[PDB]
């Protein structure tokens, strides 16, 4: 079918730890990842979904595999404790997608941020023009709590779909602990 | 047609993979694949070899498990570089090299896809230094045997250089398969970095070798060297006698002085000259 | 287990290459196996008398 | 804890072939792979290897990748073809000890406890043995950091095996200065061994480059050994070390005087066995 490789970047930072969302923040984002990796598998059997983090230690928790049983086994007692480090989060997200079996796939990443970021906006726009010369489209979806009216992420997606990119979006977080299934119902319906 | 100058270029890495897999599981006939880079009508090049696991107890070539190779063919494909299977091998343990009737059938299943898959036999037992026992083969059609026609249409004086063994000539050579002359692809990227790394003595000759016992060993030889010279004070005395060609047959029971007596002199020299010199370089260098 | 092939043991060989495949226990020579336990006779000391 | 390592020439060649198949990238790539083998009787053995896909961007050089699915199934195959063979650690191509090799080791210590690395050579030129290995040790100790960890080199050599010495000595065919007599030792350790001590003397000169000008950490634990080398420097020539030296020269050369005296009479006897075949042959044959 259409050639992509869906790569989710899960959020094991230390601000996603409370119990304001109804089951858990961890389980509600997990089953959201489950129904969208069921969305990317059943529309195209070639796509595999592994998970990466953007914490202090950007670990390959589960390897990029079409199995999800390792994903389901590690996300139980996953210990989401760590200072968020998004300035290395692009480089772990981009260089992973060059380690793939096919470079003819559409480079697509989703990114979950539920913690206050301490990046430089000048450093990301150097990474944004780095991604301009690398032709990468990433739809970042905001979870949890953050600086409201998300700071430095509007200017990054704007400098992501620049130079005739014009296809990316920025799904921001509503600061109310509602059920997050309908929150992500917009990327599963259209891009 | 073929010009009997087929000249199989192989490798430097595969031969070590061939002998290690052929020696560790020796008395059962083991096998594997040949993952090389195919070239023109004349030659063929096999650079990589991966080994295939067995099936059960018993000397056989049993069958290939295409579950294993299909996952293996795309294993290193995603990591290194693409290659293509150009042949296969097995290992006669202590025989030599031929195609048995069991060996020929699994060959004939492999020549169906490509007409140039090479059957390779290695023998990791009759090999010592300058012998690596080899001579890969390939089938000939038995259809041409009924015609009485001699194949392979010799256009160069390059094929009939090696002479086949008579034990392989008992088998299907030359009625079902043929030999192929091979050489080896060596290069300085590998040649120097295995020569200068194998036997390098570190600081051994800058020692004194057990200084009370070296002069003790300098009598452990000399004492029986006296009586071995008494034999040399004996065997020369029964000459001008029965025609010393007779002194060649007759001296196979008991020991002779003359060879044994020039033996220890080499031992009592290199043990002394090396140890006396190394003592006198330590005095200068160490203060 | 090359340490276990004591001089005296009974082993199995290969036919073709003639190498050792497997150590074996002792043999029990079926004349003696058919000498050991082929009697189901069930007579007792009650049947003997007089001695 | 580990005595020494034993490296076979298979795995030595099983890196350089991989360095050639990635040598087409041109710009920069280090060969990092998985090292397979055992260790028995406290001696580290190295038998087999392969290489894992790996990339590295120069800006923010703390982002590495090991495709562990490629690490799982290929070791799953190699355990299946050889249950005796197992993991022993890892390796990298090691020109100059790149920076990721402090936590590559900590990434994959969940397979081997003493996950040893191996530094190899791709451009062979030295007067020694260009195969390096370290070990992982950590310390809550003296001065540097609350979390401190630095590699320590364990001794390294190329071990042999009976099956591979057939193939190793077959692939050379170039030069092999065998026939160990009175002059094998003269060159393997008397020409070369004195120049062996050259680069060991010259190595502490390279540390000595910091007298007032070099790098900022100064000594603390480097000079207790260097204070001892000049202290344990050997005994001077005043004692009977003079006299007991001439004692053994007057003992070792006696055996040389006897043995050389023997060699003359032996070859003199061999002259007589050649005059028995000259004068007693010309009258008979002609
Ligand atoms: Zn065979």
mmCIF file of C-alpha atoms in Angstrom, chain A residues 91 94-96 98-99 130 134, chain D residues 25 27-32 52-66 98-101 104:
data_model
loop_
_atom_site.group_PDB
_atom_site.id
_atom_site.type_symbol
_atom_site.label_atom_id
_atom_site.label_comp_id
_atom_site.label_asym_id
_atom_site.label_seq_id
_atom_site.Cartn_x
_atom_site.Cartn_y
_atom_site.Cartn_z
ATOM 1 C CA UNK A 91 17.892 13.501 17.056
ATOM 2 C CA UNK A 94 15.194 11.304 13.189
ATOM 3 C CA UNK A 95 18.234 8.990 13.343
ATOM 4 C CA UNK A 96 15.941 6.089 14.278
ATOM 5 C CA UNK A 98 17.315 6.300 9.023
ATOM 6 C CA UNK A 99 18.062 2.947 10.708
ATOM 7 C CA UNK A 130 17.951 20.690 9.924
ATOM 8 C CA UNK A 134 15.875 16.281 5.657
ATOM 9 C CA UNK D 25 30.045 5.470 2.974
ATOM 10 C CA UNK D 27 32.499 10.179 5.274
ATOM 11 C CA UNK D 28 32.436 8.436 8.664
ATOM 12 C CA UNK D 29 31.318 5.114 10.062
ATOM 13 C CA UNK D 30 32.656 3.105 12.964
ATOM 14 C CA UNK D 31 32.240 -0.669 12.839
ATOM 15 C CA UNK D 32 30.451 -1.666 16.053
ATOM 16 C CA UNK D 52 24.924 -4.567 14.055
ATOM 17 C CA UNK D 53 23.513 -1.564 12.102
ATOM 18 C CA UNK D 54 24.705 1.695 13.612
ATOM 19 C CA UNK D 55 24.790 5.381 12.668
ATOM 20 C CA UNK D 56 26.044 8.552 14.345
ATOM 21 C CA UNK D 57 25.377 12.230 13.663
ATOM 22 C CA UNK D 58 28.182 14.589 14.649
ATOM 23 C CA UNK D 59 26.030 17.226 16.358
ATOM 24 C CA UNK D 60 24.814 15.933 19.760
ATOM 25 C CA UNK D 61 26.870 12.740 19.623
ATOM 26 C CA UNK D 62 24.991 10.962 22.427
ATOM 27 C CA UNK D 63 22.361 9.375 20.181
ATOM 28 C CA UNK D 64 23.319 5.833 19.247
ATOM 29 C CA UNK D 65 21.265 2.937 17.949
ATOM 30 C CA UNK D 66 21.480 -0.817 18.306
ATOM 31 C CA UNK D 98 34.950 7.346 20.478
ATOM 32 C CA UNK D 99 32.633 8.873 23.066
ATOM 33 C CA UNK D 100 29.553 6.582 22.848
ATOM 34 C CA UNK D 101 31.735 3.722 24.150
ATOM 35 C CA UNK D 104 27.216 1.225 24.619
#
